[PDB]
Amino acid sequence: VNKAAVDYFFVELHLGAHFEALRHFLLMEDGEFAQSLSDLLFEKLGAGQTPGELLSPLVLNSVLSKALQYSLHGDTPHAANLSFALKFLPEAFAPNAPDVLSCLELRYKVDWPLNIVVTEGCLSRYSGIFSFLLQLKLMMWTLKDVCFHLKRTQFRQLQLFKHEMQHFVKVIQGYIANQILHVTWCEFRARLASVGDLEEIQRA
Amino acid sequence: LHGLLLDQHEEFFIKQGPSSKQFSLRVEILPSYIPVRVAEKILFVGESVQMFENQNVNILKDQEDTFAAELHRLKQQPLFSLVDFEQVVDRIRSTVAEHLWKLMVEESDLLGQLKIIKDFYLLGRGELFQAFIDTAQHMLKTPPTAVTEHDVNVAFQQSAHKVLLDDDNLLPLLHLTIEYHGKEHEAPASGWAALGLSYKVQWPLHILFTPAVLEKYNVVFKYLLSVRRVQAELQHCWALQMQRKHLKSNQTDAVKWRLRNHMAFLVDNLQYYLQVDVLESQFSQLLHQINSTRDFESIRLAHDHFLSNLLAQSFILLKPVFHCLNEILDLCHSFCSLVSQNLGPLDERGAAQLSILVKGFSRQSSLLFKILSSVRNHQINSDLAQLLLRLDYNKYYTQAGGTLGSFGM
Amino acid sequence: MPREIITLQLGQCGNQIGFEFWKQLCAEHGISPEGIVEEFATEGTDRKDVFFYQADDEHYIPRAVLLDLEPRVIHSILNSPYAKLYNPENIYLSEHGGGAGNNWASGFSQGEKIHEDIFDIIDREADGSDSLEGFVLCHSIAGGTGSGLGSYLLERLNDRYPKKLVQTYSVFPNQDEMSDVVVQPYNSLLTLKRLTQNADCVVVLDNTALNRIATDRLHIQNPSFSQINQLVSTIMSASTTTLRYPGYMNNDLIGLIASLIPTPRLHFLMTGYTPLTKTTVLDVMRRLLQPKNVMVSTGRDRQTNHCYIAILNIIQGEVDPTQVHKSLQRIRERKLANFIPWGPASIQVALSRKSPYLPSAHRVSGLMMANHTSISSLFESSCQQYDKLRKREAFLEQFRKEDIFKENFDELDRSREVVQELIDEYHAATRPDYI
Amino acid sequence: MPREIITLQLGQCGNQIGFEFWKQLCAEHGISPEGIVEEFATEGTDRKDVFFYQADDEHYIPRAVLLDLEPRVIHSILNSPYAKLYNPENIYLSEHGGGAGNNWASGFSQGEKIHEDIFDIIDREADGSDSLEGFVLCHSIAGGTGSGLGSYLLERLNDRYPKKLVQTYSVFPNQDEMSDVVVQPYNSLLTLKRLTQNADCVVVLDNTALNRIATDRLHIQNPSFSQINQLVSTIMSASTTTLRYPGYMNNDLIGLIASLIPTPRLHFLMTGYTPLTTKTTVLDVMRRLLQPKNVMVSTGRDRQTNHCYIAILNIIQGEVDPTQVHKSLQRIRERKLANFIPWGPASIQVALSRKSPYLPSAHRVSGLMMANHTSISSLFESSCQQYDKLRKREAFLEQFRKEDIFKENFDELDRSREVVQELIDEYHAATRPDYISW
Questions:
Q1: Whole-angstrom Cα distance, residue A104 to residue A88?
Q2: Residue to test with chain B: of D4, D29, D31, D47, most B Cβ within 10 A
Q3: Which residues contact B149 (CB under 8 A, 6 or more apart)?
Q4: What gap in Å lies between CA A8 and CA A114, rounded to an integer?
Q5: How far apart are CA C342 and CA C434, in angstroms?
């Protein structure tokens, strides 16, 4: 009975599909979607904090709605009904031009019988790493901006320092996107139950 | 049949031993009409049954009920017959032992695990372990640190790649350990003294590689590594002398070369006797018995005998002899170090060191050769007799009191 | 927002490589040769929007503009089974069906004459791009059209979109085969100049190396132009795989260029592919490090100690990034790759998916893009060929008809100078003193 | 850390012996003629990195440099199945296809002519070696290239790598036949001189003994040079089996040298093989090896000099019972089957090795004996006498005087004859208790 119940959960409610959806959307695992979504958000923002935009979830949601046709992981029933929201309105008490702090919470809907495996406690950490990768995408957006600024033209010394820092940041980011982005993603995609354990999906 | 010690009231003459012994005898209540050999057979049987059930959780198949019916018939017998009881027990035991043997030989790749133990724990890949020594010399020259083990394991992986061992899925199962007293948060005086080996024993071999067995394997590893280090250092000193063969030879250089050559000859002959005559002989016997038998316990006993013979003939159990041999190996290493530091004429300091090493090595080699000849004369150890014969084959050692290379610095 | 990329296909070779690239993109997106998404691929997890645009009728149309001064390639595309894949309105054909005649100056004059037709396509694709990153020009550096008109179009794109990336796939002529273009050294110098000055990243597709790979590893006796263009399309697909198939790292062309071209003039990348015939991370890295699997003919100059500035491996298939890291570590321990001496060894790994429509015998394949100073040997060879022609006034009769070469060959000499500076910068970039 | 060794094959004979050596190594390691590991040999316990380089594509490239002053052998290698085994960039070939003409001075001039190519090859092989110990030159002492060019290469290796070993496999001509090379004694003397002064060990391969072995044991009537080079390759494989295949003893060249050569001048090695036949027990093997008919080195059995072993290593490869090995050593000692140095203890070592799993072995057990034995002095005396016979008659000197090594005088030949005489006398002393004082 237990095996049949959990297999029904796996094959009908697509709990593993929900897990991969929350990885794709709530942890921002879709590239060339994010590297246009965030750029277009920054066109309406920039330099860390938003300048009085993205304070309510209607501008960000409508940018997301335009973006949603374009993706590298998406266009699925489990990549639809994504919730993009703010837990802090974007007002610093000292706006700064150099800043990378981006926090927003992306979530993926999970059906009721799977919401004992895919608890909110995993989605919150997925959104925390989504925000970390969003700050990384903002940093690579600004690097693209500065490369364009140089391209369309002290300059050489600035480019040297940019290259040295970008090397070091790239090696740090590849360490992060090996340890925290690769091994746990591998052991979360190749972790869904298939003997049919109800408990094992939650523990995984 | 089930490994279940139903002894809530301590009424059975079998008690559970300290769980790692999962079972033990209650000798104080053992009825004299149960022979000790039969209680031992029952212990082995029930240990095997319990281990089989415990691992199906993590051997007689359908014959349990048949043996139960036979035991029922015995219980229905008006008189207890120890002979018939033992015969039925022996039949069950033999069936179980044959099943376990098949499982161990076919299912557990005993041959693969023994080859791994030989290559790594026993330094069977002498060229590989030479390359490993060469890679780790820098990490093991210093006392071990919390990172020295990591760096040594990286060097070992690099040496495996250098020897085209990159395809062996075993290096990730094997991890070099460093005894470092800073790991607990006496610290090993050097990385060489701190160096260990870890082997990822797979089921069922963890049944065999008991802590005592793993300690014996570590001892063998350490001994082979010590011998190989002394050999390599003496060979390096020889290479340095040959590199200087075109330079004007000094009396100290001739003395260094002669002493080094005699020390190396003695240590090499000892190592050859121990490895081939003792170690290789016992290991070949173990492997032959294991491949020749369908009893897992017989295979285990043959391997234990191989290792016991290797340890005995290496003088490891002869603590004073083992200490003298280690001192001889260290003297050979010191001589090689002196020659390698002074491939040319020695300065007054290097010459004093060389003379001290020469005299020490001559004394220790004399003691060793005399001891080995005495051991050959009192104990017919093939390998000790071979060592004594190699030492004094021309009676050069006998005339030097056994000393390889008693010629003045 | 989508990030569409407009591919400008110049001349016979450029158009054939673009056609095979669009076929490969269709296969990766589950799009038929007519541009229609296959029913089994409508719900694909592949990113088609990176390299294809989606029409309202679920047709996938390549974001490719094919501009040629010669009818042969445009007519071949419109008469191919893939004629419906390309936007017909994105195909410009010079009414002067004379082509550039393997003359760089003639190609330049033709590019000037067809400027509007090409730039209309480029602008249409940019406006049809939700977040256009830049334009990718697929052309040959050795022909007439691909060199001259390609340089003209590069100039006009650099002027109109100075904040947009300009990537080139610049085909260097075969040094070992008699070029059909007697002016090819001039065309090559001018194209190398334009790649150095107006492109952010030039992926070098050396027909010599492609032939070598086809013969030694693909067992292709006498590789045909069709097989060379198939190799080119494979390279273009591998370069766009991080855009079309969502991976964990280097998922955009901007990031690829920034990772490959730290010095804007030193933007010539060599390619390598494996297998060339269970690929392990270590076996992949070993094959990529094997010279027989590198898809760029770089001279082994023994005098210049060329070095890698950076290497990006695009690995296609189910790859564990931790196993990729372990394989890179093993490659480092074996010193299978030489890295820049003035910085940490830059080895990046991009994960991409294989085409769902193409059967892959190998669970993992790999392309290496490497910035390595020995690529300078190809630019040096092209510059030497240019100087050899200019000093002899060789093949100048066709150049003198075009305005850029009517009075003198100073544009050829400037191109040779630019290619010399590029070679010298590549050698410095192999050196700790490059900074 | 692999310990790669670069093999330099010099002249026609050296190149042919190197080709057969690489064939034997390939057969023992299961490497195809194209350098690819055979599927049955992919999991071998042999260390290939010592003698082959591994390409990133699993291609096995020999750590071999092929130098010849005559095109015939180089062309034969490039047309052989093993042409792909050697790295082409590690092959230096003299453009002067005139060879050395069996002239030591011409061989030296050819080594000078290919010096840059040769030293570029040597440096490439050293950098392609994980722990390059030194260079092993496989050449003949009687030819022109292997002798003359071999001596030149020995000098240049001693100068360039003075901390690296220079080993030679010097093929000695048949002493019983009139050498067709009237300058052969000069070539042999020059090679022996270079071995004595700039090499740590010269393995003498006497064609007279090779012919004797081929006739008596292989039943080869008139053994060809190809068969001699096949025997050389078999010997080289068995001698390198403990380096290329990890064994229990003598796994390094340093240790080998330290065990075999306590006296740098006593570097003339005799070889012995058992069984020598076209179940060999340890005792029968040792008896055959101690049998003069099974020694693969033509050393004069001088009855006047009580030759003795300085050291003996028996490398036994295959399924060997160690108790039978011990019994065989004991029987050899009791039977005095081997004469040992009188000034030191009888050094008889036995290394147990496995046969190649990739190479078919007709013999379940083979053995090589390496012995330093004073009767080798009779061979060195013979070489010195041949040198003196040529120099005293100015024989074959007209072609030498054209070459720089002999243009002014024959002092290199006379010094070589002196060195070989001193070597013979030192080997005889090494047979004597006074060797330490010799």
A1: 8
A2: D47
A3: B175, B176, B177, B178, B180, B194
A4: 11
A5: 8
